[model samples]
Target: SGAIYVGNYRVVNRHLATHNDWANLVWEDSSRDLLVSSTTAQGCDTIARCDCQTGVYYCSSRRKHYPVSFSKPSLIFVEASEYYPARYQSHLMLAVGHSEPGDCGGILRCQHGVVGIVSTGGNGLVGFADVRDLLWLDE
Candidate 1:
């Protein structure tokens, strides 16, 4: 069987916005089996078989399949504020998508990082900064 394909929205947008700056999205597949066991007495003898077995065994075994699924991406909008540095100008808008943590099969993680930008009629500029870089700045 082919590997399962899984991905999150944040990862996809990050890949797109960052372009060559970041790695591309990746997906993988996985599966597991379900076993049902039962016991019965046969002529003073105890027997066990799984659901897959044909004999009158007490326990049974069968593979349980779970197909892969994708979670919806979360949309977040950030508006320009007066507190922002004057050089950045207040004419720009930024939007980002983030995947919830521990959501393996759900949306991709967005890490609250800057992912996109929009400018007003006048010229506006946006910069991409790594999360680590922000640690040095004051709150």
Candidate 2:
């Protein structure tokens, strides 16, 4: 597979969970630390920022992360975006904007901290996967 770089650091994919479309990555340099510390993944309709029905904005990246405001309430069960056919669990969120395969694995952030990661999307919609439980399980 190809390499994935974050802020010039080459990260190794340590774990992947298909059920939630999420993964955990480790830095190649054990001594290197992440620039930002993210809070645990948040559930839908909770975070507040550039704004959502409950006021939240999610950001993800290909080269740099861009903000996409929440366009509707969070989907509480398996649901797919307009062009993304894959289904994800509760806490999945859709935004008013767009994202593509290149953005997959990008960190999803709101005002306070990260809420999830880009899953996939198109056609004015983007999908996010909440990783709270995933992180909890890892711990």
Candidate 3:
């Protein structure tokens, strides 16, 4: 299958594609999980000037990883103003808004703006959500 955002990073889904969507499987998890003296897959790339996993921004996980960054509450990279083809390999900065944490999110997810789906259950999902209207801002 092609990228969910070949045209653009669009946050769209049916809530579930069967039962769940796994973020850990792919390195595209939306949550910001940061750790002290951390690694790549653990804390994050440590974007420095654009660290959105600091303080209340970062949360804890059940794995004993203190202050794991969950991509909830929306994350905005202030350092990204234009294209970031060289800054961090290949990355782009988009969107500028606030969001809400709701029930059964990001599963089989699709995102167009910020705070995209980065996690999912182990079982599976069957639905999806339409973000074109931007009404699915709540989680």
Candidate 4:
């Protein structure tokens, strides 16, 4: 077994106005490496990150059927911002399908960089926490 530490997160339970929910995980397994595969060159780059205007985004997650496996699902009409005071205030909503609660905590990646993480999904949409403005515990 490996030890994983919960770094920083903002998950809202109450139905409030803000739609912010995310978590940062710190892995301490020295024998394993966490790498995100990419079809684009130069790997997962963070050039235009949260500035993606209008396009399709992708996120990989392990579902019930695809247990122990990850699937790349496309998201459309993604809207994100760079300004957020609190972690729970940062958000990025998109129109996505085939996403279940099992997709929660899945990393949302654009062509450039990771923009958000899966928080909640329903009603033909998925909500995420903007990782750009999150106040990470350890720099």
Best prediction by TM-score: 2
Best model per lDDT: 2
List the pairs of residues colliding in candidate 2: 51-56, 52-55, 52-56
- Candidate 1: residue 68 lDDT (0-100): 19
lDDT of each: 0.19, 0.40, 0.23, 0.35
Q: Which stretches of candidate 2 lie over 4 Å from their true place?
A: 1-62, 71-89, 132-139
Cα lDDT of candidate 2 equals 0.40
- lDDT-superior candidate, 1 or 3: 3
The candidate 4 region of ten consecutive residues with least summed lDDT is 28-37
Considering TM-score, where higher is better, how would the candidates rank from best to worst? 2, 4, 3, 1
Candidate 1 C-alpha lDDT tens digits along 1-139 = 1111111122111212233223432321111000111223212211111111011100011122212121221222333433222233221122232212121112111223221111211122122111112221111
lDDT of 1 at 42: 18
Q: What is the TM-score of each candidate against the true structure?
A: 0.13, 0.43, 0.16, 0.39
- Residue-pair clashes per candidate, as listed? 18, 3, 36, 0
Off by over 4 Å in 3: 1-69, 81-133, 136-139
Q: How well does candidate 2 score on lDDT at residue 16?
A: 24
Per-residue C-alpha lDDT of model 2 across residues 21-134, encoded as one tens digit per residue = 223333221111111122244323222223332223333343444656553334433335443343433446667665655555565555544455555466677655544333
Residue lDDT tens for model 4, 7-110: 23222222221322212223211111121111222222242234553333334543322211212233323323222222322244454454555455455555
